[PDB]
């Protein structure tokens, strides 16, 4: 890959990179031909759960628009929540590439089943 | 809760009329299909393929609207919790967040829908 080349989600097509949050967080995105989504997602975010561990990601990205799921449970360490993000990919003025996301976290607490939401912006890690 | 559907397929229909069908395999990973019929929505009518994860009382899923048919150039991904009522089964209750991009821009809307198994 290059994020140089970067036209839409297609140039992901048949690729494998890896993409941090603003909270640290690192997801490494397996793209097949068709646009599916899989690979791992792990947590680094202050003063939540699950920090650390792989969790398996799946979803789906066409042209601009890409959404995927993690569920933090992985048989080591269980959270008892999930995260879905939906977003779109914006190339930055200095080649950068972003994906900017609105997530949404469903967990039972105390007071039963909740659903938190915010903002998540990715941003492609060049790796050379 | 979701733990319960492990090796099973199963039907679930939203306030909006829309039906996926999920497939969850003995990981709690979870493949189907999602048939959209909300008022004011493109993309009504035929399978888009649906993708995520399904573990104790919670799951998160993801269907990219585009299925080499019907293009709608967005994306949407839904987290959601079972609720248990008065019968069999369970709702899912869930928030989704709708990603596309036109003329203002890269835009996300949300909202909830709730599942109800059949
Ligand atoms: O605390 C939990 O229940 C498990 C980890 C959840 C982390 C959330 S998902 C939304 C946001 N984006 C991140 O990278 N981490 C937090
Ligand atoms: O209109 C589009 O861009 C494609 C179809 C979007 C359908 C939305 S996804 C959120 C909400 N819940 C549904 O069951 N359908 C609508």
Same mark, same amino acid.
């Given at each position: 890959f290059?994020?140089?080349?970067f036209?839409?989600f297609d140039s992901?097509s048949?690729?494998?990179?890896? @993409? /941090?949050?603003?909270?640290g967080?690192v997801?490494? =995105?397996? /793209?097949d031909?068709?646009?599916?989504v899989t690979?791992?997602?792990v947590?680094?975010?202050?003063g ?14 066409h042209?601009?628009? =890409? ?8 048989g ?17 003025f200095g080649?950068?590439v972003?994906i900017?996301?609105? @997530?949404?976290?469903?967990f ?6 909740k =659903?938190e939401?915010?903002?998540? /912006?990715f941003?492609?890690q060049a790796?050379?």
């Amino acid at each position: 890959f290059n994020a140089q080349g970067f036209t839409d989600f297609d140039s992901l097509s048949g690729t494998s990179t890896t @993409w /941090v949050n603003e909270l640290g967080s690192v997801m490494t =995105i397996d /793209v097949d031909r068709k646009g599916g989504v899989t690979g791992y997602f792990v947590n680094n975010a202050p003063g939540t759960g699950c920090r650390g561990l792989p969790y398996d990601l799946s979803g789906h990205a066409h042209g601009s628009t =890409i959404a995927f799921s993690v569920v933090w449970s992985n048989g080591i360490a269980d959270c008892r929540s999930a995260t879905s993000w939906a977003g779109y990919a914006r190339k930055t003025f200095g080649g950068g590439v972003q994906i900017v996301t609105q @997530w949404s976290l469903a967990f039972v607490g105390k007071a039963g089943g909740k =659903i938190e939401t915010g903002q998540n /912006v990715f941003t492609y890690q060049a790796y050379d």
